[PDB]
């Protein structure tokens, strides 16, 4: 209703991304999470970007 | 205000009864809470589905100080 | 295909794939085909002449199907691992 779709992008060269949602009002900063990148086959930091 | 509504039935209940031989992985009971608890060689899934973790025979028991119901699996 | 009005099965489900124009000028050859060519030399031309592959085929593969009981010289054809073993067992020759 207010909760927007965002994509978390792999900080490695790969263009791999996870997709999730966010309340942009209450949480205006960039969501940042270690996740598994299946292309370099390792856990790497992932950073919000626009869907 | 107005009535006239209901939801699809979820087909919960016991799928394998006492004595029945099952292969590992087989669902033994679908339930909404833990009316039945997982006993030996039986696992509890996220919707409280009890399933076989081993090939064998389904076994219902009542155990412990609270007289709870447990489903386990006996090797056959 | 009509199902009464319900979105039918061939619309319910998604399309997939594309068609390879290359597959259509690519043929497979059986071991049983190698003796059927006049000259003990198997090429694209030879196989065409013996009516084993189509006239417009530009690539062919000898596969392990049937058997070969005569020495053959295959040439300009791809050959499967198995087929190469079978062709050579019967005294044959493969070459690019």
């Amino acid at each position: 209703g207010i909760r927007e779709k965002i994509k978390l992008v792999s900080s490695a060269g790969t263009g791999h991304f996870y997709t999730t949602t966010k309340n942009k009002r209450t949480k205006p900063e960039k969501l940042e999470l270690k996740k598994f990148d299946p292309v370099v086959r390792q856990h790497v930091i992932y950073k919000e970007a626009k869907i | 205000t107005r009535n006239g509504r209901d939801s699809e039935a979820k087909r919960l209940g016991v799928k394998r009864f006492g004595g029945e031989s099952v292969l590992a992985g087989s669902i033994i009971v679908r339930q909404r809470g833990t009316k039945f608890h997982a006993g030996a060689n039986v696992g509890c899934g996220r919707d409280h589905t009890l399933f076989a973790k081993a090939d064998g025979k389904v076994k219902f028991e009542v155990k412990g100080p609270k007289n709870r119901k447990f489903i386990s699996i006996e090797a056959e | 295909g009509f199902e009464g009005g319900q979105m039918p099965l061939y619309r319910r489900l998604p399309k997939f794939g594309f068609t390879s124009r290359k597959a259509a000028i690519t043929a497979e050859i059986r071991l049983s085909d190698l003796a059927k060519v006049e000259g003990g030399v198997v090429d694209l031309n030879t196989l065409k002449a013996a009516n084993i592959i189509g006239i417009q085929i530009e690539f062919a593969k000898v596969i392990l199907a049937g058997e070969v009981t005569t020495p053959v010289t295959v040439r300009g054809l791809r050959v499967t691992k198995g087929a190469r073993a079978a062709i050579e067992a019967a005294g044959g020759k493969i070459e690019e």
Binding site: I51 | - | G1, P8, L9, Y10, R12, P14, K15, F16
Partner: protein, 64 residues
Amino acid sequence: PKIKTVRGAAKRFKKTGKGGFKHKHANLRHILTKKATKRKRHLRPKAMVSKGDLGLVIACLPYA
């Protein structure tokens, strides 16, 4: 005259070695973010047409 292929069927089913048909799963086109990764994993591989539906598909693909 020749029977005509239902051409939209022919873009969704392919005949396999024993005469059944393989097809692509529904629900993996869009509205994906909310769908579990597990669920989507199991929709990737192709699947076989069911017994109830073979009559319909075969009727649509007389030259398959």
